[PDB]
Amino acid sequence: EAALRDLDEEGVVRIGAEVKPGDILVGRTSFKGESEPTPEERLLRSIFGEKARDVKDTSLRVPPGEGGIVVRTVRLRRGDPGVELKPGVREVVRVYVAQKRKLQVGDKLANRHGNKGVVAKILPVEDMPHLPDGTPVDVILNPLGV
Amino acid sequence: FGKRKGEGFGVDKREVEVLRRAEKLGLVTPGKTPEEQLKELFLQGKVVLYDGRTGEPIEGPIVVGQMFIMKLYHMVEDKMHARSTGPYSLITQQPLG
Amino acid sequence: ERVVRDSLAALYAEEDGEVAKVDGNRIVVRYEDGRLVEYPLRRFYRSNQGTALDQRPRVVVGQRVRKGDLLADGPASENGFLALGQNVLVAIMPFDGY
Amino acid sequence: SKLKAPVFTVRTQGREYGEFVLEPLERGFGVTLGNPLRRILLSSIPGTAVTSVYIEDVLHEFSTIPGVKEDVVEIILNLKELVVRFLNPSLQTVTLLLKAEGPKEVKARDFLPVADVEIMNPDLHIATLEEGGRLNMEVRVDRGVGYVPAEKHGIKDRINAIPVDAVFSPVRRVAFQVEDTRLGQRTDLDKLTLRIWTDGSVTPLEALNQAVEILREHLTYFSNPQ
Amino acid sequence: LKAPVFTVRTQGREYGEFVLEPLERGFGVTLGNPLRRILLSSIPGTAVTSVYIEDVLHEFSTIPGVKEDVVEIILNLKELVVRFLNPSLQTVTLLLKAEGPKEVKARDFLPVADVEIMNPDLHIATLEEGGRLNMEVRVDRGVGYVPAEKHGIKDRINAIPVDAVFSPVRRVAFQVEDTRLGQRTDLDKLTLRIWTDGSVTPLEALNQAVEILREHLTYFSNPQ
Amino acid sequence: IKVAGRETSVGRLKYVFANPDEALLAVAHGIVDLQDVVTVRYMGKRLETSPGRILFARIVAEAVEDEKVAWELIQLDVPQEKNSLKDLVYQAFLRLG
Amino acid sequence: AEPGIDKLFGMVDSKYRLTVVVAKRAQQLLRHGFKNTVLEPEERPKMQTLEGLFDDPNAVTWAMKELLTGRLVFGENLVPEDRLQKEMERLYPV
Amino acid sequence: RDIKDEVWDALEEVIHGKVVLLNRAPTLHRLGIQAFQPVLVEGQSIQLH
């Protein structure tokens, strides 16, 4: 239930949630093939009093290094009005996910003169060069670039 | 600066050590008031700068100013990737790309 | 300014008039022609490259607007000038390797 | 011979600004004292700032409320400013409250009052509402230190509660002059003048004491060697 | 926020390494940067401050029957190290005469009361037979560094003033590297190294430095 | 300036240190700059260089932990630039590993 | 650099014969639990875990330090392969 | 979410002593690839010497 706490009854994440790598965005089930349990596996379940289940977790999770705040979901079925999809598809679900992106070490900066570089370090304001009236500079661009 | 010399603060001791140096460089005219000379550096785009790790000045006058600088579409978030093992290719059995 | 104009991303006033309502979602303007045109705001649209194409409003109720004035800022637009980045206080010096 | 304890002047202006002089100190102690205090004055001085927000009928930061011109992005960004001073010391966390409507330009004051809390910047603009525009917030401000960003503290009181970035530290700026001086006999001594600017939650002077206190506390760590 | 553990490693009387970790972000510099200043400014030691030699007018001359020049002798003399054992003491003259085929050392300085020559084998000059050396050296308690041409102290016409190497600290050097404690990873680690002349000791040198700093903290007491 | 025969400089007379620590303690206290040529006594021979040129040599000498060898490798009487430094690394490599 | 590498290159006739000796010895130790090591408990490579110091797992760090001691023999055609691979599983079991 | 802090102390243990290989864009010579002991870091970017 932990792994499901953010899904509506249909299997869609709730608009306005926080999703991170591993998280299911949409539960989906699919039927098992001619590998319906082999001996090794039928027996292992024979021990656990839970007999072979016939559907599978094919859900749509989030890929490594992505994630954000579910902003929206579109659900297109067929059997509903307006809609008809490529042959053999019952329903398609799209879920748009937002991220606020602060600047970070690795991002690339540039100015209109061809000066470009990758943020390599973020000092705390106390280390920044500053002028006598106490104000600290924002950016330190090395002169060897010019 | 004028804002300063009226708020109860004159020139600063590290601004003179810098000016000593700026003069050897040749940025400022020898024998001229601190304000006269800071003026001369300012006109050059240059100002006195203190390393915040020490309070000591930068041995020189620096170019500080206001610059238009954009964030490009190329962010580490879109580009950090690594794999122990994963999908493979039908005929070659070598990992996808 | 032109660039924001032709970029057809910022939002402007079709004829002289006055601002009826204003809102994170729409802007309705009473015109000298008695028409009540209601421009709605493309708020937080996803672009081909993922970069939020967001429209924000730049007038308040009652604001008396001549023709061709601004009503909402596109993305990368700040009162109608192309804002591709940020103005920062820049210092030009070696900094210890970084 | 050795110079002796110098004369501590103090020139507080309002609740925000201060000039703090020390005269005379041996040459080479202007900075010896003026920098490390400024470093502590920027990092380590506790303070307050908003930490989370429930807006009614809102579920995530990127939303939009009707009849309000500002988007939540800008409202969370107007609430970052809000500086809020605790009176009782052992208070760690408040929960301000708000609700306005009609054609009112909600400002920082329109927040309900609470005892042991003063809105040191009441004129701070929040949001613009028009005929029909509602609003019902529940801000949550917190004492704490430094800079702690939303992606880090995740504070949500309700469920649909947007974490916010906190500039805890109350120190808007810190400069310090060092000027030439003399105690009659000797030349090249230093007149340390320390500026401090502030929001009000703590004060230019209470900052300076708290700064020194930490500095003093740190030297204690050299007590016990191995 | 644990108690920052403090570690010492001394070779002898002239060198020690003092490491203090972990520390909140920025502090390894906010600390022993000032120490740096202080430990070079304000650690009271002693220093040869003037020298008179019997037939010697000015600094830039050669003594006859002597191998060294005048400056050479003044340089060796800049390197003498002496401790004042009586807290009251604050000045001293040192007298030394000898001649013939000898080479003088800091031992050969006529002894004095509560005045300890640390580095006695320190060579001063060599004499060839027929070579005379008869000289008086003034020595004061003081701090920091004072060029000769800027204290000028002269006890008699023809005594030369010498640059004043007070500080028993010879160099300070500190290195603040990044370090991590479990989850929190921005912490400063403050290694600090302190060279002394043996007069005072690195560890001693530090504690004084620390003391001087707290004391100035209290100079934020009685406003006006 | 030519002074009583040999050519020397004002600063090689005012300031004369018997060891390198002292010259750098002078630099510590505002007395001289690193780029000022002075007189200092390092490993016997009484030398005319700057304190900076002296600090450099200590940099090498402390890093390879062989003060004698490090003294032969550097060429001191000259500013370090791409070539001299390249030459130092090759020379270090051959004789120290 | 690798602690004491210049002397390692001195033992071998060609840098690549060091690499093979190292990597071989490195694995003699990985399968055997190090029990055949020719180090004493103070020479033991140690890593520092959060709890406290512990034997270095990296069998190559070991192999290289081991090589410096001189307590190893290197060369071609010194043993039958299978007389080693059990005399050692005898003297130090898996 | 499930990754607990002592995973990282566990990794630190893992890579002790061993090196990784770095390659940059055109391997023109033998040195578009060199080996390095890796020290872990937060943030995405690689740190080159």
Ligand SMILES: Nc1ccn([C@@H]2O[C@H](COP(=O)(O)OP(=O)(O)OP(=O)(O)O)C[C@H]2O)c(=O)n1
């Ligand atoms: N088609 C390309 C384009 C780039 N590169 C790689 O990127 C390098 C190009 O960067 P430049 O700025 O053009 O070369 P630099 O040598 O870095 O120029 P500078 O001296 O001004 O730093 C060359 C090459 O390593 C490449 O291999 N193939």
